[PDB]
Design a protein around this ligand. Sequence first.
Ligand SMILES: C=CC(=O)Nc1cccc2c1ncn2C
Length: 306
Amino acid sequence: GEAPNQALLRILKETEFKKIKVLGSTVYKGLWIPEGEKVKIPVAIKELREATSPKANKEILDEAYVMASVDNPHVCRLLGICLTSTVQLIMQLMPFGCLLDYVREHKDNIGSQYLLNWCVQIAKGMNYLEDRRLVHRDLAARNVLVKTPQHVKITDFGRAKLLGAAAAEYHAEGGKVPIKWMALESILHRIYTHQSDVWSYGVTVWELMTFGSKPYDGIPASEISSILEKGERLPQPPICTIDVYMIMVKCWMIDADSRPKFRELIIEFSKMARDPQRYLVIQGDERMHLPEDMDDVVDADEYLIP
Ligand SMILES: C=CC(=O)Nc1cccc2c1ncn2C
C-alpha cells in the first residue's frame, strides 16, 4: 500500500530544557540543551494546560506525529516531546512570530522582494507537503511562522491528514472550521485535497498582499458558500499587478483541477521574485529594510540528527 514512516519521535527529559518566558496563553520561549551535546537550541515549548483531558492529549500527539514526519526548510521543525504530567511539544523557536501579525505590525517596512519571496517559500513548503501526500487543511497567514524576515515556515498540523494508498480526497465530520480560507468543495461536501490547499494558499497570499486584512471582513461564514457559488471572490489588493491577482484568482476556480499546482506557484512567484517592482507596486519600495552565554547557541536548522 504505502511506504513505512520511519521518522524518529524523540522523548526529551524535562531537565534538558529551561522555559525563559511565556509567548502566548500556553507556548513558552526556552532553551534546549540535548544531554551531553554542548549546544543550546532556542525552542518554543507548547505545554497543555488542563492535562486531565484525554481528548486534548490525542489531538496533541496527532500533531506531534505529523510534525515528526516532515523534514523541509519551509515546514516547522519538531525537536521532540516531553511526557510530564502535561505533554510538552518542543519546536524550533520562530522568534518573529506568525506572518499575519508580522505583516500587520511592519506594513510600512515590507517591500515587494520580501512578499514574493514569502509566496515562493510557502509554495515550496506546500509542494513538499503534497509530495508527502499530506493535506494541511488550515493554511492561513496565521499558520506561517517567521524564523527571520528572509525565512518563513508552515506551521499548525492540527487539521493535517495523510491521503490513503488510493485516497485522492479526505472526508471530515464537524468542528470549528476556517470557512473564509476554505475551497468551495470543502465547505459544501467536506472534500479536502492538495487542490483545496491551493485555494487556501490564494487566500493566504491575499492576506500578505493586503498587509493582514481579514478576508470577506464583516460577512457571516454561513453567507460565504452562497457568495462563492454566485462567482464572487476577494478583491484585487491595491499593491497587486493583474499578474499577481490573476494567480490568486486561478487558485479560487470552482474546478479544483483548473487551479495551479504548488509546483507551478513556485515557478510563477520565482519569475516575479526576479523583478519584484514589476509585479508589486508599493510606495517607497526601494528604501525598505528588515532584520547568559549564547556561545554554544545553534539554531535548530543547524542541529541535525542521524
Ligand atoms: C515572539 C515570538 C513568538 O511568538 N513565536 C512563536 C509563536 C507561536 C508558535 C511558535 C513560535 N515560535 C515557534 N513556534 C512553534
